[PDB]
Amino acid sequence: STIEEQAKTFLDKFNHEAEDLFYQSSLASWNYNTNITEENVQNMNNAGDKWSAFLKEQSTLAQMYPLQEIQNLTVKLQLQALQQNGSSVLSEDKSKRLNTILNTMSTIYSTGKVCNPDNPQECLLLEPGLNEIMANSLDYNERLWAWESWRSEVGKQLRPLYEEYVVLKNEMARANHYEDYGDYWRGDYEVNGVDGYDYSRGQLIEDVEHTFEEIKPLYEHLHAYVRAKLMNAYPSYISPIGCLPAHLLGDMWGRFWTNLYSLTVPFGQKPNIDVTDAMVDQAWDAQRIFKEAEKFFVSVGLPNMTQGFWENSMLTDPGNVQKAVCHPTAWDLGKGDFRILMCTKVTMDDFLTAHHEMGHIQYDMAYAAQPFLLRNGANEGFHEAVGEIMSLSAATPKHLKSIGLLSPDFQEDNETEINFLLKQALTIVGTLPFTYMLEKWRWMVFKGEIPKDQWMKKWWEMKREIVGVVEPVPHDETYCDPASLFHVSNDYSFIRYYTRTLYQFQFQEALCQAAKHEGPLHKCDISNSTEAGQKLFNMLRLGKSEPWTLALENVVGAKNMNVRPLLNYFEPLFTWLKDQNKNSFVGWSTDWSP
Amino acid sequence: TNLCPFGEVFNATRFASVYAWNRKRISNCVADYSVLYNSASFSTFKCYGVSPTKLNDLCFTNVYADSFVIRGDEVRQIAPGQTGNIADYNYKLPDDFTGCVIAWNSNNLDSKVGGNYNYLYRLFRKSNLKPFERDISTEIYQAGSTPCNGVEGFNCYFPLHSYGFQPTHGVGYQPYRVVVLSFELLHAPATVCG
Numbered sequence: 125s126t127i128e129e130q131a132k133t134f135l136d137k138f139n140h141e142a143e144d145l146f147y148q149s150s151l152a153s154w155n156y157n158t159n160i161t162e163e164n165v166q167n168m169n170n171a172g173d174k175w176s177a178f179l180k181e182q183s184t185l186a187q188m189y190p191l192q193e194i195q196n197l198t199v200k201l202q203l204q205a206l207q208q209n210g211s212s213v214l215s216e217d218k219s220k221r222l223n224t225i226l227n228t229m230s231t232i233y234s235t236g237k238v239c240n241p242d243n244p245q246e247c248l249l250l251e252p253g254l255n256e257i258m259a260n261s262l263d264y265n266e267r268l269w270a271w272e273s274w275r276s277e278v279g280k281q282l283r284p285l286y287e288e289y290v291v292l293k294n295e296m297a298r299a300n301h302y303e304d305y306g307d308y309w310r311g312d313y314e315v316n317g318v319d320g321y322d323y324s325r326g327q328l329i330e331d332v333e334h335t336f337e338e339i340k341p342l343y344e345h346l347h348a349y350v351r352a353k354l355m356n357a358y359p360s361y362i363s364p365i366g367c368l369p370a371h372l373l374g375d376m377w378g379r380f381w382t383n384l385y386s387l388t389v390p391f392g393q394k395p396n397i398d399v400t401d402a403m404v405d406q407a408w409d410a411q412r413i414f415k416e417a418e419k420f421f422v423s424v425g426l427p428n429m430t431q432g433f434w435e436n437s438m439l440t441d442p443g444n445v446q447k448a449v450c451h452p453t454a455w456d457l458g459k460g461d462f463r464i465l466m467c468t469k470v471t472m473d474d475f476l477t478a479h480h481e482m483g484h485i486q487y488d489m490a491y492a493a494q495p496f497l498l499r500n501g502a503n504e505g506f507h508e509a510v511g512e513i514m515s516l517s518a519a520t521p522k523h524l525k526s527i528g529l530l531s532p533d534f535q536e537d538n539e540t541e542i543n544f545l546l547k548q549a550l551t552i553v554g555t556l557p558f559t560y561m562l563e564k565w566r567w568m569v570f571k572g573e574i575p576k577d578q579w580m581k582k583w584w585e586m587k588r589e590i591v592g593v594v595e596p597v598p599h600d601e602t603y604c605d606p607a608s609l610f611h612v613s614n615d616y617s618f619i620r621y622y623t624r625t626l627y628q629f630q631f632q633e634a635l636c637q638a639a640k641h642e643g644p645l646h647k648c649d650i651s652n653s654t655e656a657g658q659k660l661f662n663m664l665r666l667g668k669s670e671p672w673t674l675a676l677e678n679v680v681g682a683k684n685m686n687v688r689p690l691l692n693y694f695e696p697l698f699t700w701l702k703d704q705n706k707n708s709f710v711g712w713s714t715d716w717s718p
Numbered sequence: 719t720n721l722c723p724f725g726e727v728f729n730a731t732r733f734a735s736v737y738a739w740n741r742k743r744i745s746n747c748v749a750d751y752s753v754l755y756n757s758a759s760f761s762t763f764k765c766y767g768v769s770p771t772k773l774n775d776l777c778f779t780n781v782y783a784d785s786f787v788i789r790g791d792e793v794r795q796i797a798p799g800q801t802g803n804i805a806d807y808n809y810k811l812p813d814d815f816t817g818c819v820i821a822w823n824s825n826n827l828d829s830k831v832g833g834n835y836n837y838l839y840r841l842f843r844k845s846n847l848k849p850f851e852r853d854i855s856t857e858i859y860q861a862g863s864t865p866c867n868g869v870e871g872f873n874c875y876f877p878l879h880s881y882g883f884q885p886t887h888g889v890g891y892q893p894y895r896v897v898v899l900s901f902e903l904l905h906a907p908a909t910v911c912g
């Protein structure tokens with residue numbers, strides 16, 4: 125009868141059709157991912173094209189349901205998520221050119237190879253060649269060569285491609301009544317039409333800037349201490365008051381700072397916690413690791429894995445016979461098919477990753493009752509944050525001592541948790557300024573607050589005010605340095621990681637304030653606390669049926685990104701860094717350059 | 719005198735779709751529910767209006783066995799007073815239901831790799847069904863005001879879809895064979911007892 129009932133019936137049909145076709149597409153992509161064969165590639169591409177064509181057709185048939193006449197909010201959310209026509213709003217010629225640019229970017233990034241200044245025929249790709257160069261070399265000159273060569277090989281190649289990409293994505297976004305493509309992306313955190321829980325797309329920019337402003341002291345202390353350690357590791361190549369070199373940050377592009385741990389560990393003599401030896405000594409295997417993670421999740425009352433998870437997921441590399449792409453991934457194939465694909469080597473890192481991916485799968489099981497369009501995190505940063513808090517809880521020495529992978533003879537003195545917190549901050553507080561800066565630059569580019577000839581001129585400007593990173597060599601505008609990243613090149617939203625980092629600590633503090641945990645936050649262990657488990661499940665089961673602000677308040681009690689949990693988590697480390705940095709100039713000067 | 723043919727209802731290989739469920743009538747025989755109760759392989763043996771024990775020592779004039787295949791996450795809808803797609807559009811159990819709903823996982827037979835699209839449920843209906851009334855009529859469903867003229871289009875939908883049953887589906891989406899026994903009493907002499 126009414127338009128609302130017609131839209132309800134339409135979405136009722138779309139739910140079942142999309143469930144079937146998404147199950148087929150994901151099953152084909154899974155069969156490819158476990159078994160890299162060209163026939164499997166054919167199956168995957170056929171099913172993916174079928175899914176994309178079905179999405180296009182359903183978006184078309186949905187656009188004739190006007191949103192302004194829908195009083196329901198879940199129906200409005202589904203219709204909004206389905207009516208966004210994407211690149212189809214553009215003409216065929218420009219859309220084909222855009223897809224060509226996207227595929228050329230993907231190929232240029234995924235196939236580019238850098239070569240030595242003497243052997244241009246035998247040389248190395250990004251992975252694992254440049255990967256190991258950045259993650260293991262302590263040679264300044266080798267890292268500088270790797271960095272400059274890859275920036276001047278893939279970035280320069282993608283620069284005109286990125287120009288066309290940006291200037292066509294602006295057309296695509298404004299054709300959907302968006303201010304830019306950056307606004308299109310921020311439209312994930314946007315909430316409208318809910319009183320007391322609305323969220324504008326500029327509200328996200330405001331909130332991200334505010335939380336980063338609050339972080340800036342802790343990050344700056346971490347950066348100063350790391351700068352002092354690299355002073356003691358590279359005498360003449362760093363200034364005592366300046367910033368850090370770009371190439372010398374443990375990674376190709378300074379996303380994570382983990383690979384500085386050996387060069388920045390607070391107490392090298394103290395034994396870092398590593399139960400991999402205690403795992404091989406008890407003959408632990410992949411099945412044992414995942415059973416331990418499942419038992420951990422049952423401890424907090426979240427349901428144990430379905431039998432299909434044990435049967436159908438690839439928890440171990442199937443030998444050297446068949447080759448597979450086994451980055452550890454969680455797969456919600458739909459219709460109750462939850463799987464994890466990971467080549468599990470018995471290790472503490474892989475133990476933590478098993479907890480991470482089982483957290484992903486547990487979140488996926490939570491909202492398996494929401495309609496198909498609402499089976500995702502409340503926003504893009506919720507799903508990986510729920511995945512990350514479980515690794516945080518499992519890595520704690522209390523859990524390890526309780527599961528029998530750490531002997532009760534182990535003693536916790538200030539040195540070991542300082543080591544733990546520095547590791548955690550190198551992983552986490554290192555990536556926050558980089559992520560925020562990169563997405564700030566990208567949004568400025570998309571909106572147009574930057575003339576094109578001033579991209580890098582501004583980009584390496586803000587490195588100096590935001591992250592504290594100087595360019596080892598000057599760059600002209602033909603460079604497109606950010607495209608050297610997997611996400612900038614391959615058209616991905618990068619602020620999901622900043623938001624994820626904030627929400628994970630908010631979730632952790634909320635859960636073990638509901639777990640009655642007494643003591644420092646970094647000792648937070650949620651195991652055996654069914655109260656925290658129920659608290660988190662109340663948020664998890666929503667999917668994105670309710671606004672992300674309301675879902676976040678369902679656990680934290682705040683409607684916004686609360687930076688306070690992160691600072692509270694790193695409080696012991698923050699105090700230790702303040703004590704340590706008394707004989708160093710905290711704060712970096714933007715003028716000094718290599 | 720003879721044993722009531724419950725086996726061929728349960729031993730059968732082809733169950734109907736839920737929208738076109740099979741009705742089989744049992745009468746003029748002595749019914750043994752002991753195997754039904756003690757099978758212990760059923761994942762849902764819920765009896766309404768009668769207890770599992772006393773029904774064996776009870777007389778009825780007619781029994782109806784309604785066979786069909788549904789999802790697992792929908793077996794709950796086979797119960798008096800329930801509401802959903804299966805309860806309202808496909809198969810309705812009355813509020814005063816006086817029979818036993820039996821349901822067992824059948825992921826092995828009724829699901830095959832690539833999908834077993836032979837089982838259909840009625841996704842849309844103009845009005846919810848009545849108790850024990852079958853709706854196999856397949857007129858195109860008109861959501862809006864414009865008539866359909868028997869073709870697919872805006873506000874116009876085919877009223878039947880299929881569970882793409884696969885062996886790797888979750889337990890709630892795994893196929894579940896459901897046999898619904900309904901016991902009836904009339905003024906005519908009872909024929910199902912013993």
Ligand SMILES: *[C@@H]1O[C@H](CO)[C@@H](O)[C@H](O)[C@H]1NC(C)=O
Nearest residue numbers: 159160161162163164442446
């Ligand atoms: C991998 O794919 C090939 C090609 O389809 C197939 O012959 C082989 O059986 C597959 N491996 C497994 C373990 O199924």
Ligand SMILES: *[C@@H]1O[C@H](CO)[C@@H](O)[C@H](O)[C@H]1NC(C)=O
Nearest residue numbers: 132195196197198199200495
């Ligand atoms: C919105 O629709 C859902 C089903 O689509 C329904 O359960 C809910 O009650 C509706 N909202 C309101 C306020 O009635």
Ligand SMILES: *[C@@H]1O[C@H](CO)[C@@H](O)[C@H](O)[C@H]1NC(C)=O
Nearest residue numbers: 422427428429430431432434
């Ligand atoms: C998970 O725990 C429940 C609790 O009773 C149990 O019924 C179920 O069998 C367990 N899952 C598996 C796969 O064993």
Ligand SMILES: *[C@@H]1O[C@H](CO)[C@@H](O)[C@H](O)[C@H]1NC(C)=O
Nearest residue numbers: 423522523526527649651652
């Ligand atoms: C959880 O509780 C069980 C039983 O009370 C105990 O055996 C186990 O060690 C506990 N684990 C943790 C991490 O508290």
Ligand SMILES: *[C@@H]1O[C@H](CO)[C@@H](O)[C@H](O)[C@H]1NC(C)=O
Nearest residue numbers: 723724725726728729730753
């Ligand atoms: C049909 O198969 C079942 C096995 O579960 C069993 O009742 C018997 O073998 C067959 N039925 C009859 C009435 O024999």
